Design a protein around this ligand. Structure first.
Ligand SMILES: [Mg+2]
Ligand SMILES: [Mg+2]
Ligand SMILES: [Mg+2]
Ligand SMILES: [Mg+2]
Ligand SMILES: [Mg+2]
Ligand SMILES: [Mg+2]
Ligand SMILES: [Mg+2]
Ligand SMILES: [Mg+2]
Ligand SMILES: [Mg+2]
Ligand SMILES: [Mg+2]
Ligand SMILES: [Mg+2]
Ligand SMILES: [Mg+2]
Ligand SMILES: [Mg+2]
Ligand SMILES: [Mg+2]
Ligand SMILES: [Mg+2]
Ligand SMILES: [Mg+2]
Ligand SMILES: [Mg+2]
Ligand SMILES: [Mg+2]
Ligand SMILES: [Mg+2]
Ligand SMILES: [Mg+2]
Ligand SMILES: [Mg+2]
Ligand SMILES: [Mg+2]
Ligand SMILES: [Mg+2]
Ligand SMILES: [Mg+2]
Ligand SMILES: [Mg+2]
Ligand SMILES: [Mg+2]
Ligand SMILES: [Mg+2]
Ligand SMILES: [Mg+2]
Ligand SMILES: [Mg+2]
Ligand SMILES: [Mg+2]
Ligand SMILES: [Mg+2]
Ligand SMILES: [Mg+2]
Ligand SMILES: [Mg+2]
Lengths: 152, 209, 101, 202
RNA sequence: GUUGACCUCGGAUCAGGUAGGAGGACCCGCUGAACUUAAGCAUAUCAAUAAGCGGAGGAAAAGAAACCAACAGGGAUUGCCCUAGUAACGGCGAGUGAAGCGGCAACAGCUCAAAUUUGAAAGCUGGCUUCGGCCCGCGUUGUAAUUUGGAGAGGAUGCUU
RNA sequence: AAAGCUCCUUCGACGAGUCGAGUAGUUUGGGAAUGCUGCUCAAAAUGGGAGGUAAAUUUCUUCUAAAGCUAAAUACCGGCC
């Protein structure tokens, strides 16, 4: 509906003879789509990246943290592929990037980037390098606990 | 079972050859059908020639090296030199071959001249009669004796070089110093011994250190 | 014109005399050329994925080991000596970068 | 685009990450049915490369097929003829396991046209493929000149006639001297070579 | 906390569709003999045939080079003539056996993956509609436009369509 | 708006259990292995395939696989005339 209204007012503008992009202004919006986001961080236009933690084929996003680290762009693995989807008016998004914000919340963007950095990346700097656990089942864990307790 | 002085028979009829015999009682009927198809397609291409313009091409091997014939199509370089756009060439009766190259100025120039003659003889009708453009024939030179067979009107003028030529005496070229037979022997020997001589020369050069 | 033919068959530079022109490279001939993004993508993917078991074996035979053994093992794994030597060069580059990082 | 990264990653089938993903997905596919609909391609880059599109009318089916050669199905191994024909065990099927997978998926989904297929996993006893199929009766397919060629009757059961990629590989359809016997069709070429041509004016 | 999303997986005589069988001379594959010839016979031959199985059309198939070549270079596919009973294969026995070039018939070229539209998913199915559009759904795990190596993308530049 | 041409520094993405190798079977005129298939190993980036004798080394030539569509000339008297 917003796009239809914008197109209608642009139509009135160029029917009046005033050129397009005079009635409308430059849009600031969050960036989505996997290929689009990947290109944005490759060209360093992305200021912050949020990668869904539950991408069915992790391959599609398994390289994204490494790509963001290589390109020096702050990233965060966030919970909710469906959450990103409903943020972006789709079913799923699987990746989201913010590049530019308006001046009224450039300070909010800076605060969010700093908070994400110092509260996610610095803590996961070491845990991201280790292998995923080979955690056993409940009964196996109890058996090992009993074995260790009997030994000691 | 041979019985006399016979050439040893090798007739390959030990399979069931009768199952795959191809007679040709339909040769005249097929010719009639071919003529009818040719007439129909010529009528469909009403003012245009029935074929596409082809370039001159030299046959590959050392046999047939001496003869030229018609090729598949003109190269991009030939079209560019003749000034005919690549997308415009196939729509005006010119065959285009994108995978052939012009390794020699002689073939390039011959095909360029061929294309230029064709363009000079081309009559281009406007897309709409009531508004001709600057690239079309302006309705006055649009009437002339045309050709409908580019394979004959633009054939290979001489596939082979002229086998006979007269020159005045004292213009006879001097022979190869050692003779043609010796020259051929020397060239053969050099080709045979190029590698052995090379390895011997490098060995003698490196023997000092 | 690369080289002018001798105008006679049966020779070192045999062939009919034609003025051979040099021509611009066709785009097909570029197939093996390297590109910026391809290099970037391949390096990032190598960092993400790591090494294969046979590559690790070759690296172990290469550093503190035997080059003839590495060559023989690489040829056995890949099937071709050219591929084996290219792989050995790549793993030598990997070893040098890791050791001088 | 991320599909270039996916293509590069798929080459590293011996790496730890790809090996782990392959092992887990092999277990899952083995637990599933021999043939089953797959909601989305597990190899998006491979599917898009082979022609898959993310629109209505495109279907992915996952199929596993038994592995190994083709034992001759004769009773008690007794072939009745000359010793050169006594082989039973080390004989090989002339088509591919990929072709068998495509044929079985086509039989399962007769109403669709097998567009292509690709390897997704391997096992000691099974090979796993994903088959891209197209609906020739869907309007989204019938209206698209990029794909609606498959709606024509000449493309019924391409996988059965050997017209898919694996069929074109098995049939020897390549240019050059190495494919003299199979360039234009092996049986057709043999018939041409063994036909005796007799004209009127011999 | 429940509902609510989305991810898989299901039900329904749900709405709309589709497949089977026939025919099978010719066509595309699979599978596959033995009689016979070798004056016996086992490799071989018959034959990459008959029988068996699957799948199409008016033609099918093939097809726009990861080709041929080695030349002064040819230039998608198919078919005829020739190459040629040749190169080669073969208890080198019986026997088998192509291809390039060359002449001709007919000629037709193309589109996807791999790029960010990112100043606007611009794309599509279904339903309603006076015809202006509306709604749901698909789709960002990518539907349109652009590009396919013969290039192209980015810039200049003046003509042209 | 869209489209072609003339010049240009630069850039120039190009298909993976795929190629290739080994082995086995079959097939081919294809002979230290012509194609196909099974199993095992398993690529690269002027890389790769081919260049009809196996191998190492050095050159050269030629194309650009592992995705797809496409009249005609060709077969066929099975079907209807
Ligand atoms: Mg008989
Ligand atoms: Mg769907
Ligand atoms: Mg019996
Ligand atoms: Mg026998
Ligand atoms: Mg006679
Ligand atoms: Mg119903
Ligand atoms: Mg039904
Ligand atoms: Mg049927
Ligand atoms: Mg006998
Ligand atoms: Mg007898
Ligand atoms: Mg007997
Ligand atoms: Mg045979
Ligand atoms: Mg039969
Ligand atoms: Mg016809
Ligand atoms: Mg067809
Ligand atoms: Mg091409
Ligand atoms: Mg050439
Ligand atoms: Mg040809
Ligand atoms: Mg043999
Ligand atoms: Mg034979
Ligand atoms: Mg010819
Ligand atoms: Mg509609
Ligand atoms: Mg390609
Ligand atoms: Mg292979
Ligand atoms: Mg090979
Ligand atoms: Mg093999
Ligand atoms: Mg073998
Ligand atoms: Mg067989
Ligand atoms: Mg063999
Ligand atoms: Mg050689
Ligand atoms: Mg292909
Ligand atoms: Mg192709
Ligand atoms: Mg086809």
């Amino acid at each position: 509906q917003e796009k239809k209204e914008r197109l209608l007012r642009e139509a009135t503008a160029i029917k009046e003879g005033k050129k397009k992009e005079d009635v409308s202004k430059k849009p600031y919006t969050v960036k989505y789509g996997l290929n689009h986001v990947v290109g944005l961080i490759e060209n360093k236009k992305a200021s912050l990246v949020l990668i869904a933690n539950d991408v069915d084929p992790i391959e599609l996003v398994v390289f994204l943290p490494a790509l963001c680290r290589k390109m020096g762009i702050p990233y965060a693995i966030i919970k909710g592929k469906a959450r990103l989807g409903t943020l972006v008016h789709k079913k799923t998004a699987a990746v989201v990037a913010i590049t530019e914000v308006r001046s009224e919340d450039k300070n909010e963007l800076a605060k969010l980037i700093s908070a994400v950095k110092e509260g996610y990346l610095e803590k996961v700097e070491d845990t991201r390098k280790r292998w995923g656990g080979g955690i056993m089942g409940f009964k196996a864990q109890k058996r090992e606990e009993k074995r260790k307790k009997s030994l000691e | 079972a041979i019985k006399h002085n016979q050439q040893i028979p090798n007739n390959h009829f030990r399979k069931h050859w009768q199952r795959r015999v191809r007679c040709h009682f339909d040769q005249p009927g097929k010719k009639v059908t071919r003529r009818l198809a040719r007439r129909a397609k010529a009528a469909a291409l009403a003012p245009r020639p029935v074929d596409k313009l082809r370039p001159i091409v030299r046959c590959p091997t050392v046999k047939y090296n001496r003869r030229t014939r018609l090729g598949r199509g003109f190269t991009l370089e030939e079209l560019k030199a003749a000034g005919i756009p690549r997308l415009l060439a196939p729509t005006i009766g010119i065959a285009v071959d994108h995978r052939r190259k012009n390794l020699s100025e002689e073939s390039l120039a011959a095909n360029v001249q061929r294309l230029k003659d064709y363009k000079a003889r081309l009559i281009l009708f406007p897309r709409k009669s009531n508004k001709p453009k600057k690239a079309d024939t302006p309705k006055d030179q649009q009437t002339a004796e045309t050709t409908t067979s580019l394979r004959t009107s633009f054939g290979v003028e001489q596939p082979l070089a002229p086998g006979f030529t007269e020159i005045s005496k004292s213009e006879i070229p001097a022979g190869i110093e050692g003779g043609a037979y010796r020259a051929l022997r020397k060239a053969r020997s050099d080709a045979r011994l190029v590698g052995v001589r090379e390895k011997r020369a490098k060995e003698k050069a490196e023997a000092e250190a | 014109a690369p080289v002018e033919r001798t105008g006679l068959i049966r020779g070192l530079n045999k062939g009919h005399k034609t003025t051979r022109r040099v021509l611009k490279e066709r785009p097909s001939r570029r197939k093996g050329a390297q590109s910026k993004r391809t290099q970037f993508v391949r390096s990032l993917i190598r960092e993400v994925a790591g090494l294969a078991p046979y590559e690790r074996r070759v690296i172990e035979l290469l550093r503190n080991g035997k080059d003839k053994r590495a060559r023989k093992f690489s040829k056995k794994k890949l099937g071709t000596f050219g591929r084996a030597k290219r792989k050995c060069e790549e793993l030598q580059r990997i070893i040098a970068e890791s050791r001088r990082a | 685009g991320a599909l270039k990264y996916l293509e590069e990653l798929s080459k590293k089938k011996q790496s730890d990450v790809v090996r782990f993903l392959l092992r887990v997905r092999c277990w899952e596919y083995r637990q599933l049915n021999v043939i089953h609909r797959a909601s989305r391609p597990s190899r998006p880059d491979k599917a898009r490369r082979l022609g898959y599109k993310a629109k209505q009318g495109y279907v992915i089916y996952r199929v596993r097929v038994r592995r190994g050669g083709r034992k001759r199905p004769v009773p008690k191994g007794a072939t009745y003829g000359k010793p050169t024909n006594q082989g039973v065990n080390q004989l090989k099927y002339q088509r591919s396991l990929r072709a068998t997978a495509e044929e079985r998926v086509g039989r399962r989904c007769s109403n669709l046209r097998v567009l292509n297929s690709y390897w997704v996993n391997q096992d000691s006893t099974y090979k796993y493929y994903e088959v891209i199929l197209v609906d020739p009766n869907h309007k989204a397919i019938r209206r698209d000149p990029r794909i609606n060629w498959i709606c024509n009757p000449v493309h019924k059961h391409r996988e059965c006639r050997g017209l898919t990629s694996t069929g074109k590989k098995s049939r020897g359809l390549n240019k050059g001297h190495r494919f003299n016997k199979t360039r234009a069709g092996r049986r057709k070429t043999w018939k041409r070579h063994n036909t005796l041509s007799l004209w009127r004016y011999r």
